[PDB]
C-alpha cells in the first residue's frame, strides 16, 4: 500500500510513515509508528530522537510531548519491520502511544490542537510530518432527541425532536415540530436553527450552522404538526470566522469539527451541536436538544 516519506532539510533524515490519520478510538489511541533513515557518519550529535508534539496553536501550549531514542538503541511493528527491510541497515524505527484524555485534532475556522511527528539529531537537523488524531462517529445510534416546552392564562405547548442523534457531516437532520397554541397570541413565526459551540478549555461561543425561519403561523387555539429538514454543512459557513473545523493536514478544505466525544477538564477544544426550536410570538418561546455531528467509519 501507500507509505508516506519526508526528507530532512539536509536530505539525510527520511521519516517514513504509513498513515496521517490516527483514529482516536474512544478507549485508546492509535500509536504513531515510523522509521527514520540515518547515515551514521553524518550524525554528529551521536543521538537521534523522534518526538510527538500535541500542540495547541493560536499561545502554543503543548499537552503531551514525548521522545523516543532512535539511535543509539536505549519492540517493533509490522509496518516498521517492512520499512526497515526496504531501507536497509541505515534506518531506525520509532513508536508513540497517545494517552487518553487528550484533545482531538481540531481547528477554528479563520488555532486549535494539532499532532506532529518531529525527528531530530540530538533547525537543519529537524524534520516534521503532520498527522491527525481524530474520532469516528459512534458505532450505534443514540436516543432520539426530544424537547417540549410550555409557556403560560393558557399554554403554548411546544415540542421539537430529531429522528436520531448520530448524524454524519453534510447530512440533513429532520426537525419534527408539534405546536398547540391554546394562548390568544398568534404564532408569528417559527425558527429551527442548529448552533455549534466550541469551548476552549475557558472561552466559548455559539455559531449557527443551520437556520430555517418559517412563517408556519398557527392561529390562537389551534394545533400544528410538521417535519422540517435542515442540513448543516460548509456551503454557507465560509464567512463565519471561528467555526470549529475538523482536523487538517494542510490548507485542505475540511468539514465541521466532529462533535468532541468524551468518556470534562480536557484542554484543547470541546465542540458540540444543538438544534433550537424558537417560536416568535406576538415574548418568544425556546426549546432545544443536542446532537453530535461527526464523520462515519469507512468499511
Amino acid at each position, epitope marked *: 500500500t501507500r507509505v508516506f516519506k519526508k526528507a530532512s532539510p539536509n536530505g539525510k533524515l527520511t521519516v517514513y510513515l504509513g*498513515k496521517r*490519520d490516527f*483514529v482516536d478510538h474512544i478507549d485508546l489511541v492509535e500509536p504513531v509508528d515510523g522509521v527514520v533513515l540515518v547515515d551514521p557518519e553524518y550524525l554528529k550529535e551521536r543521538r537521534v530522537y523522534v518526538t510527538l508534539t500535541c500542540a495547541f496553536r493560536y499561545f502554543r501550549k503543548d499537552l503531551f510531548v514525548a521522545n523516543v531514542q532512535s539511535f543509539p538503541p536505549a519492540p517493533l511493528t509490522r509496518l516498521q519491520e517492512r520499512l526497515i527491510k526496504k531501507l536497509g541497515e541505515h534506518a531506525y524505527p520509532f513508536t508513540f502511544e497517545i494517552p487518553p484524555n487528550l484533545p482531538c485534532s481540531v481547528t477554528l475556522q479563520p488555532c486549535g490542537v494539532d499532532y506532529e511527528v518531529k525527528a531530530f539529531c540530538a533547525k537543519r537537523n529537524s524534520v516534521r510530518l503532520v498527522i*491527525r488524531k*481524530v474520532q*469516528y462517529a459512534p458505532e450505534r445510534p443514540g436516543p432520539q432527541p426530544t424537547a417540549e416546552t410550555t409557556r403560560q392564562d393558557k399554554p403554548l405547548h411546544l415540542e421539537a425532536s430529531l429522528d436520531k442523534e448520530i448524524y*454524519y*457531516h*453534510g*447530512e*440533513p437532520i429532520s426537525v419534527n415540530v408539534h405546536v398547540t397554541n391554546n394562548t390568544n397570541k398568534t404564532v408569528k413565526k417559527i425558527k429551527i436553527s442548529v448552533r455549534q459551540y466550541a469551548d476552549i478549555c475557558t472561552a466559548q461561543y455559539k455559531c449557527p450552522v443551520a437556520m430555517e425561519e418559517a412563517d408556519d403561523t398557527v392561529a390562537p387555539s389551534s394545533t400544528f404538526c410538521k417535519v422540517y*429538514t435542515l*442540513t448543516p*454543512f*460548509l*456551503a*454557507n459557513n*465560509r464567512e463565519k470566522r471561528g467555526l470549529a473545523l*475538523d482536523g487538517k493536514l494542510k490548507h*485542505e*478544505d*475540511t*468539514n465541521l469539527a466532529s462533535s468532541t466525544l468524551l468518556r470534562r477538564e480536557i484542554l484543547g477544544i470541546i465542540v458540540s451541536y444543538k438544534v433550537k426550536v424558537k417560536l416568535v410570538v406576538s415574548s418568544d418561546v425556546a426549546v432545544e436538544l443536542p446532537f453530535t455531528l461527526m*464523520h*462515519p467509519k*469507512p468499511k
Partner: antibody
Amino acid sequence: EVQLVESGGGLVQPGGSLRLSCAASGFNVSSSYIHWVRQAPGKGLEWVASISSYYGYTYYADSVKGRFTISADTSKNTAYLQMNSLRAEDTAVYYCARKSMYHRGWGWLSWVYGAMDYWGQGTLVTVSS
Amino acid sequence: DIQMTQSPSSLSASVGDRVTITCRASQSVSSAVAWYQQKPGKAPKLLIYSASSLYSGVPSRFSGSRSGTDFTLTISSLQPEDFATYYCQQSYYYPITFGQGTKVEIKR
C-alpha cells in the same frame, strides 16, 4: 444502493431552455461530487460539469462555461443542471455520475475528483428548430 | 487544459488477443487516470482508476500501468463482449477531459 436518475430529456429549439435534474439516491449531494457528462451522437465522451454542495464548489467544462448552471437542492437531495442557451453543440445523450468522498480512511477527500464510479441512465437532449 | 491523447483510434483483434491501448497526458498527471468502456449508446462504465487500480466489478484481465505520463491499458485475452470504445480520463486538472476513444473491432 447508490443510483442517479436523470430527467428533462426532450426536444428544445436552439437557444431554448431545459432543466436537467439528476436525482441522487444512496448518498447526499454533499458527501459526493455530482458530475454531468454528455456524449454527442455517436462520438467520444465529454464531461459537462461537477458540483459538491458541502463546499458549494462548482466546476464546468469549457463547452458549458456560463451557458449552463449546476446547483443542487440538498433538501430534496437532487442536483439541477439548468441548461440555457442551447445550440447544435449541446445536442447529446446526457448521463449523470458521482464521485463519493469516502475511502480516505477517515473522511472527505476534497480533491480527488476521481473516477465517476456510478453512472445514471442517459437522457437524450435535442437541439433543433 | 489537458489533452489525454489516446491511441490507436481504432484497432482490430479477436478472442484472446492481448490488446494494448496507450494514452498520454498533454501535461504532467499524478496517477489521476481512469478507463471507461462505452458500448454503443449505453452509459460509459469504469475500468481503471488512480492510473493503475482495477475498479470494483471490472474484469481482472483489464489492467492499467503507468510509465511516467504514458498510461497503458491492456486486456490480456480480449473477449467477444469486450469490443467497445475505451476512453482515458484524468481527474487532476479541471475541467476533466477524456481521450478520443479506441474502438476495438472484430477480425476476419
